Each structure stands twice: as structure tokens, then as C-alpha cells.
């Protein structure tokens, strides 16, 4: 009954289609309509390190898999799963017969390999990634059969079939035991010979250059590191590659509902483009057949996508951005400077720098109107929405601002009028910001004069986002603005609500890496923080959805109690488009990292018409 592309139909190696499908393939449901094979999907990368283009444009593929309105996932890689009554052991059920890229056997000793010699060895990740974590307790992972693998938790772990569906969370299916075996000590007794074939001189180092992670740019920029991807590297990503180019995976594992092996497309190509100019004329020429990942956030692409759909054959469609804020400003509470820091951790300085902003003037120059005032929390729509901390200190109120900071004894003035500290100098605030982000940056340079009338002096410090992270996790910074997430996706990314992630909850990365090391690194939170993060294990370990959903409330209201953080607008629409010809383009779906979007809507069952 199955069929294959007629591309495939002229590699002779190649098995029948019957033998390269699992014996019972996924069956895909397309999004409008049954498609036809061919083509190329032209799309776009911007610079070198945009490897996380390619893998949200071809989509993770995990063993479970977020529905198109992203309230749950589905058994993807695995066939079925089971999960026990206590919610502490997870069974997975394998499609037997599925094949690796290159035609070997895909089982749970693949699984088992990822999980055992590669995530949870402590010399490859000395911390464990978060994903596979429940309050920082890792679980057991075993091979019951060839096509049945066993994860048990210490804990109970509700989330982890959403943990799975996530990038981060595709571990389990990413690296092939027989060709990643080759580079590890455990397998292989002469791995040392492999150092010097590469430019390494660890094992670590070995296998991110030969069978990489996530979000290392080696995991494109090889041919023959093998895969479960619909499309497989040809033309590979690298330094200073022009382009990329992917061709159909023929051991691909899915079919449609008349029996074609997928993808319906042949290739995926990547046109590498440096400066964002040359990606806005070239996909308002009609040059991409789907750009869902660059333009959208940028405000002034806009009016220029909608005006040449006509001329250039294609449709905008509008996603809704999961993060709760497009530009946020983190305040760091473990700040260096001293003076300023007996400020910082004070509930109504806070307050003052919140009502000394005006969030209509910032919406209205640097996001074109199209966005909202919104401080950090989840909106309307979400069963955690909570009032307080969506929406207090909105308005500005320049006469209270400045009425509480007198009260905090800020109230001598220096000779350019800024007030200074009762014992010190001018009440200064370093803001970091990646200076590729111009909506951002221009945000800030608003804050800095509206924040210059409360007698507040903010400097501005844009960098490489290369230094950008280096500042934050160096914990030299007094705020750094980026994106607050919840939205849409609290659950998911909860780091402006308790600092929980080593890189992004900059309220403080030092209390963050106290949480992950169990105290014994960084700095000791404040005891609302610590109140939280214990709420926060509770959370993550509770048994039942009712009490999961208690206590991460109670983790929202004391985040709003604290106001650690201050929003300036929730996202604009994010604007992308495809093309005329590219049909099973799902135009309602979400935007967002945990998502991979724009392949969540599953660009193995696009087609041309």
C-alpha cells in the first residue's frame, strides 16, 4: 500500500518502501489538505549562528509531540506511552521496524545511549540539563525490550510528556548509539585516535563536534551524522557557508493518510544572509516560500510585507508570541554596586522606576502602536492569569515615582539635577542590551529620558549577544532587557517568575545558580525567593494537576508581591508568511521557542500546489 517519492524511486540501494517504513508508520493528518511530492522549500538564515533556524524549520522530533493549539502533546517518536498512578514512571512504547537515516535499526538502545551515556554522564553534562530533571533529581532510564524503553523518576513528574515535545527536550531521540558509540570512552577503547582525527583533545569535546546537542551549530554541519529528520543535511551549515541545502530523509518514518512516505517536499533550501536589510527585500520580493522566524518581531517589516503580497506571491499571516512581554527589563537584585543595591532590593524603588515610564510613548515609537502596555504575568485567556501581576503600575504617575523616591532619602541633587544616594553619587543604572535588537534598544534610549525627569540616570551598554551573555552570567549588569515569557507558556518557561534558569532569570543569576546547585553555589535569595523555589519543587513534583496548580499559583502572587521585574508591552503580532504555492501552512499556530515554531505545524506534510 505504501508509496515513495519519485525521487527515491531512482537510488537502486534503496530498500522498498515497506521495509524503510516502521511496520506501523505515524500517520499525519495534513493541516488542509492531501498533498502531492516536489519541490524545494526556499527559506533563510541570518549569519552563522542561526543553526536554531534550520531546527525550527524542519521541526524536533521527540518522542512526543504539542498539539496544533498547543494545550497538550501526543505520543510522536514513541508509538503510545504509559505513565504509572503515582506519576513517577514513564513507558514508552517504540514503532518497531523504524530506521535511522541511514538505514540501521532505530530501538531503545538508541534511547537508552542517549539518556545513560550522554545526557546523564557527569563528564558530558557536569549539570544535568533542567528537561530531564524533576526538582533537580534524575531518573533511571532502562531498556525493558528493543522497542520499549523505561524512564523512572524519584519524583513525580506531570510535565515531561510536554518536556519532550519542547527542543530541549529531544534528547532521547538525537544521538544514534552505533555512530555516536564510536566517540565515547565507554565503547570505544581507542577514542583517543578520534582526538587527533578532529580538532579536539577531550571526549566532551569529541562527541559536540561529531554527534553535537541541541543548539550547537555542528549538529548541521555534518552529512554523516545520522538522524530521524524528515530532511538530512546535504549542503552543510558552517562558518561561512552561503547556504544550506536538505534533501528527503528515504527512511523518514511517517506517512499521510493515502499511504506517501513523507515529506512531500524533496528539499529545504537556506539562503545564509548577513545583514537583516537583505532578508526584508529579498522576502517582500517574494523570495521565500515560508520566513516565520526573522521578520515578525520587527515591528517595520510589517507595513512593507503586507504592501508587495500581490507583487510577490505571498500571504502574512499573524502569530500569536507566547512571552508575556517583547521587552523586558530584568532588574538585578545581586547588582555589584553597593549603594545602588540598597535600592535595587526595595520593593517601592522598584515601583518609582515602573511609574516613571510611559509605556504609550514606548508602544507607540518603537513598536508602531501595534503592541500593549503589560508587566510580566500570563494573559486573560490562561487558566494563571493574575490581575496584579499583569497590570500593576501601568500608568505612568511621574508625580508618585517622584514622591516615593524622595521618601527613599534619594532627594539631594548633583549639578545636572539627577539625584545621587544619601551617601554617595548619581543614582546610575547599567542596562544591557544586543544591539541587534533595535526595538529594544530604542526602548531603552525612551526609558533613559523618561526616567531622566525622575531624576534617574540610565546607561545603555549594546554589545554582540555573544558579550550580552557574558555579562549576565559575569553578574555584571544592573538590568538587562530581553523578553519576558508566560503569556502562554508559564509553565514552560517560569524564569521571570522564580530564578530557576542559570542563563535568562536575571532578576538574579547568582539566586539561579543557588537554586541548581542546591545552595551550594551563587548567592542566597531573599526569603520570598526561597519561599518560591521551594513552592516551585512542590510544584514540579505534585502529584495531582490540582495541587500542581495551587501551588504554582502561589508562585505567581508572590512574583506580583515582589515585582522584581517590569514589562513594558506585550508582543505585537508577530507577522510571517509563506507562500501562495505553499499549502498546509497552519496560520493560527502560536509562536515560540518551546514550540520550534514555525515547525510545529509539521513542514513534512507542506506541499506545493
Not at 515610564?357 to 503592541?371: C, S
Request: charged content about 20%; proline content about 6%.
Amino acid at each position: 500500500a505504501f508509496t515513495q517519492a519519485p525521487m527515491l524511486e531512482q537510488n537502486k540501494q534503496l530498500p522498498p518502501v515497506d521495509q524503510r517504513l516502521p511496520e506501523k508508520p505515524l500517520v499525519i493528518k495534513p493541516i488542509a489538505s492531501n498533498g502531492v511530492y516536489g519541490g524545494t522549500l526556499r527559506t533563510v538564515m541570518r549569519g552563522n549562528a542561526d543553526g536554531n533556524g534550520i531546527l525550527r524549520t524542519i521541526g524536533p522530533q521527540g518522542l512526543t509531540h504539542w498539539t496544533q493549539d498547543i494545550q497538550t502533546v501526543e505520543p510522536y517518536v514513541a508509538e503510545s506511552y504509559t505513565v504509572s498512578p503515582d506519576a513517577m514512571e514513564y513507558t514508552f512504547k517504540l514503532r518497531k521496524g523504524m530506521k535511522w537515516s541511514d538505514g540501521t535499526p532505530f530501538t531503545a538502545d538508541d534511547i537508552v545511549f542517549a539518556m545513560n551515556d550522554v545526557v546523564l554522564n557527569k563528564e558530558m553534562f557536569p549539570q544535568t540539563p533542567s528537561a530531564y530533571l524533576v526538582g533537580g533529581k534524575a531518573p533511571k532510564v532502562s531498556k525493558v525490550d528493543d522497542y520499549t524503553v523505561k524512564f523512572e523518576f524519584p519524583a513525580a513528574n506531570l510535565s515531561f510528556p510536554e518536556t519532550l515535545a519542547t527542543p530541549l527536550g529531544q534528547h532521547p531521540t538525537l544521538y544514534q548509539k552505533k555512530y555516536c558509540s564510536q566517540f565515547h570512552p565507554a565503547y570505544n577503547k581507542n577514542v583517543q585516535a578520534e582526538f587527533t582525527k578532529a580538532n579536539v583533545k577531550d571526549w566532551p569535546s569529541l562527541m559536540r563536534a561529531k554527534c553535537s546537542d541541541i543548539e550547537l551549530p555542528s549538529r548541521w554541519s555534518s552529512t554523516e551524522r545520522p538522524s530521524i529528520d524528515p530532511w538530512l543535511i546535504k549542503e552543510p551549515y558552517g562558518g561561512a557557508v552561503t547556504r544550506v541545502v536538505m534533501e528527503r530523509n528515504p527512511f523518514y518514518w511517517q506517512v499521510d493518510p493515502t499511504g506517501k512516505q513523507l515529506p512531500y517536499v524533496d528539499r529545504i533550501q537556506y539562503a545564509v544572509v548577513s545583514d537583516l536589510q537583505a532578508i526584508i527585500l529579498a522576502a517582500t520580493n517574494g523570495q521565500y516560500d515560508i520566513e516565520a522566524r526573522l521578520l515578525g518581531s520587527d515591528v517595520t517589516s510589517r507595513p512593507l510585507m503586507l504592501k508587495n503580497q500581490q507583487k510577490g506571491g505571498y500571504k502574512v499571516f499573524g502569530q500569536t508570541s507566547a512571552n508575556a512581554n517583547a521587552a523586558g527589563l530584568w532588574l538585578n537584585q545581586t547588582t555589584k554596586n553597593e549603594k545602588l543595591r540598597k535600592y535595587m532590593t526595595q520593593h517601592d524603588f522598584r515601583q518609582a522606576l515602573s511609574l516613571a515610564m510611559d509605556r504609550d510613548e514606548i508602544n507607540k515609537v518603537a513598536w508602531l502602536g501595534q503592541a500593549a502596555p503589560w508587566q510580566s504575568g500570563p494573559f486573560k485567556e490562561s487558566k494563571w492569569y493574575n490581575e496584579k501581576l499583569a497590570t500593576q503600575y501601568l500608568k505612568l504617575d511621574l508625580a508618585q515615582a517622584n514622591q516615593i523616591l524622595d521618601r527613599l532619602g534619594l532627594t539631594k541633587r548633583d549639578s545636572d539635577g539627577y539625584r545621587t544616594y544619601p551617601d554617595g553619587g548619581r543614582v546610575s543604572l547599567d542596562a544591557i542590551v544586543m544591539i541587534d535588537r533595535q526595538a529594544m534598544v530604542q526602548t531603552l534610549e525612551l526609558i533613559r529620558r523618561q526616567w531622566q525627569k525622575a531624576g534617574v540616570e540610565l546607561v545603555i551598554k549594546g554589545s554582540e549577544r555573544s558579550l550580552f551573555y557574558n555579562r549576565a552570567t559575569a553578574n555584571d549588569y544592573d538590568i538587562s532587557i530581553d523578553v519576558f515569557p508566560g503569556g502562554l507558556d508559564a509553565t514552560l518557561n517560569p524564569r521571570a517568575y522564580v530564578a530557576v534558569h542559570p542563563l535568562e532569570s536575571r532578576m538574579s543569576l547568582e539566586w539561579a545558580k543557588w537554586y541548581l546547585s542546591g545552595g551550594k553555589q551563587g548567592i542566597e535569595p531573599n526569603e520570598s525567593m526561597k519561599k518560591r523555589m521551594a513552592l516551585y519543587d512542590q510544584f514540579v513534583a505534585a502529584k495531582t494537576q490540582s495541587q500542581a496548580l495551587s501551588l504554582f499559583k502561589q508562585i505567581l502572587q508572590i512574583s506580583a508581591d515582589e515585582f522584581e521585574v517590569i514589562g513594558t508591552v506585550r508582543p505585537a503580532v508577530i507577522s510571517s508568511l509563506h507562500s501562495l504555492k505553499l499549502q498546509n501552512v497552519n496560520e493560527k499556530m502560536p509562536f515560540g521557542w518551546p514550540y520550534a515554531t514555525p515547525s510545529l505545524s509539521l513542514p513534512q506534510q507542506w506541499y506545493f500546489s
